[PDB]
Amino acid sequence: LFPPQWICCDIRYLDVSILGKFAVVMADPPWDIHMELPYGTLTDDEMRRLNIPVLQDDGFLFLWVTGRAMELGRECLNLWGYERVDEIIWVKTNQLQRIIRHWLNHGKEHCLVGVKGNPQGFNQGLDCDVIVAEVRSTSHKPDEIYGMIERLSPGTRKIELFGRPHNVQPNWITLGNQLDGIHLLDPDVVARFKQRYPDGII
């Protein structure tokens, strides 16, 4: 039940095949949503081209989507070899359990759930598809998703794409370009890393 692992990298260019197969993939990409944004985004094409299909044979993808990414994320999810089988929504609250206030004020964020191949020994139907939790930062997903994923697939290995530092968790490998260097302990991964990247230069 490995402690947290991560790789600061550009996920467009990393050879993800070194990392092996995962029961669960979660991605919270900075989609191009056709609005000016504080942070950098990936184009539609770089999102479609991500080498997601190498990361799993059998299991679930959790894909955070906003705005036109509700449609683009569904495209990407099908291009990558997944069927969308669930959609979680996170109801954003304050500390008093009140909803935080376009044709419409947005009270929620959407996570698409994809299935690939024949997942076996998952505990389906333990949690429900609604998360109610406080917004603690701008641009952070709630920590409860890690709990729901753990109960769904206890002690399996998982990978998060575009995760931030607070998102490093046991049983998870976190990728993104705001993490602090490379911290890898799974010796399978350590060996395939050293072999592919003898000078550590991603």
Binding site: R101, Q124, G125, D127, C128, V132
Partner: protein
């Protein structure tokens, strides 16, 4: 952690959401509204082009087999010629359920010529009572109503109510409040409405209606000059 909580107790996280002068608008909407009109019509076997004039707002509530834990499949819904009765600038609110409807309803929106601009979630609480499609990963406790627009904010994209009793198929009336608050135009069509959904300001068309009062000419008359462009949120003009 209410996910954790739900796993222990069967109280849905949404059970814990507390507290779930715009009467001025509500009054204008009330004064602006046309008399209720309604037509029994078997929508499968009926040329919707008879529904005139072209609608500003369509609320489409097809009876999915999933609502029952004649049903319409997505195959049947996707063949409706909705683009033939929609005004060039208009809105659609499509009730898509919790399953494959979240995908097939988007295909429908694009087929009829709309782009989705909101996703309204009906989140069902089980406070009075603390079922699974085989493909489901999680317990499904919500339904989606997709808002579509073609052509060219008091309210939130959530409706929270208690789960209705078993085989009660009704959608929360709040959806009408959300749609009326947008002031989109006074030609409002509800397809697959019932006796129980009939409402001032709407034309309701559905198979189970017991009575009809619809007349294309009388209905057209409510929207002829001086009234053609009214938003639905402004007074009628004097006479």
């Amino acid at each position: 952690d209410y996910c954790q909580h739900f796993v222990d107790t069967g109280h849905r996280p949404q059970n814990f959401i507390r507290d779930v002068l715009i009467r001025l608008k509500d009054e204008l909407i009330a004064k602006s509204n046309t008399p209720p009109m309604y037509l029994q019509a078997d929508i499968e076997a009926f040329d919707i082009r008879e529904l005139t004039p072209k609608f500003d707002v369509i609320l489409l509530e097809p009876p999915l087999e999933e609502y029952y834990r004649k049903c319409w499949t997505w195959d049947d819904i996707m063949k409706l010629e909705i683009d033939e009765i929609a005004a060039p600038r208009s809105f659609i609110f499509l009730w898509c359920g919790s399953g494959e409807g979240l995908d097939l309803g988007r295909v429908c929106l694009r087929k009829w010529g709309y782009r989705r601009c909101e996703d309204i979630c009906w989140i069902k609480t089980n406070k009075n009572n603390p079922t699974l499609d085989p493909k489901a990963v999680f317990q499904r406790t919500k339904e989606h109503c997709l808002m579509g627009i073609k052509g060219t904010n008091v309210d939130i994209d959530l409706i929270i109510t208690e789960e209705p009793e078993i085989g009660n198929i009704e959608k929360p009336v709040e959806i009408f409040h959300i749609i009326e608050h947008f002031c989109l135009g006074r030609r409002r069509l509800h397809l697959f409405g019932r006796d129980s959904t009939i409402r001032p300001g709407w034309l309701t068309v559905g198979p189970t209606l017991t009575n009809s009062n619809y007349n294309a000419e009388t209905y057209a008359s409510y929207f002829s000059a001086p009234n053609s462009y009214l938003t639905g949120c402004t007074e009628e003009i004097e006479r």
